């Protein structure tokens, strides 16, 4: 039996640190896909 918080497992990511990284990464993709373009992120499509 589970004795404690009734919860589902969870993963924490700091909003500031991920964003800062994202901004630096998204600029690197534009060294290929061109200086100006729209880059959108989305979760997994589907599968196993």
């Amino acid at each position, epitope marked *: 039996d*589970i*004795i*404690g*918080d*009734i*919860r589902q497992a969870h993963c924490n990511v700091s909003k500031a640190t991920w964003n800062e990284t994202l901004g630096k990464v998204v600029k690197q993709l534009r060294k290929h896909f061109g200086n100006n373009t729209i880059i959108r992120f989305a979760n997994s499509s589907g599968g196993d």
Partner: antibody
Amino acid sequence: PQLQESGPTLVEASETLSLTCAVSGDSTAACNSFWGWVRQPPGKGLEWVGSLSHCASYWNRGWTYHNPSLKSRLTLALDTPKNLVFLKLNSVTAADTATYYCARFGGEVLRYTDWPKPAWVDLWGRGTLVTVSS
Amino acid sequence: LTQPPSASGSPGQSITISCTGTSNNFVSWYQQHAGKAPKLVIYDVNKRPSGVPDRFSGSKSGNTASLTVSGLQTDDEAVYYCGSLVGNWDVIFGGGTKLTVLG
């Protein structure tokens, strides 16, 4: 399950009041209930003192609850191997004179959300009277 | 919590004592005989504990909590306190209601 209170029945003012509860028939290690005290002044109502428990979570080594007014002057302690409860009151006055009961707190202790939520005393002790005189 | 100072009734009659200030369901009532230790007669509102007669029933409507004792008898004469959890983990008690079933 039996709770036996023990300690000085007569304490002088401004001194340190110490009381010890001896549990019988149950383990203090059990995460099903909290252990603490409830004092009842002579011919007056029931007042909550405090309770604690070593059964902790990932960010703490335990839980300890103090009554906001009595917080400064009290210290709560639990002996897990020896199955004993402790209460220490610093700078005691004649206003603190009461019949002290060893209390077991029930509630959302075995399955809680966020912090544990003890709400009622299921098992009481016989209690002892401590009179504070200067 | 505000508990009525007194309450009286004849044997066999039913008494209902109230309590207010309870916004949650953690309400509980206690019975303390004079010169004795308090005993919990009810918990989690309506729910009863072991060795407690059916005639004891808890109830809570809105901000008001209520205890009901039917079929009064000699052993029911005592002081009745109510208590409940508030906020995060603190708990408070009412002034208590003194119910007498004397002859």
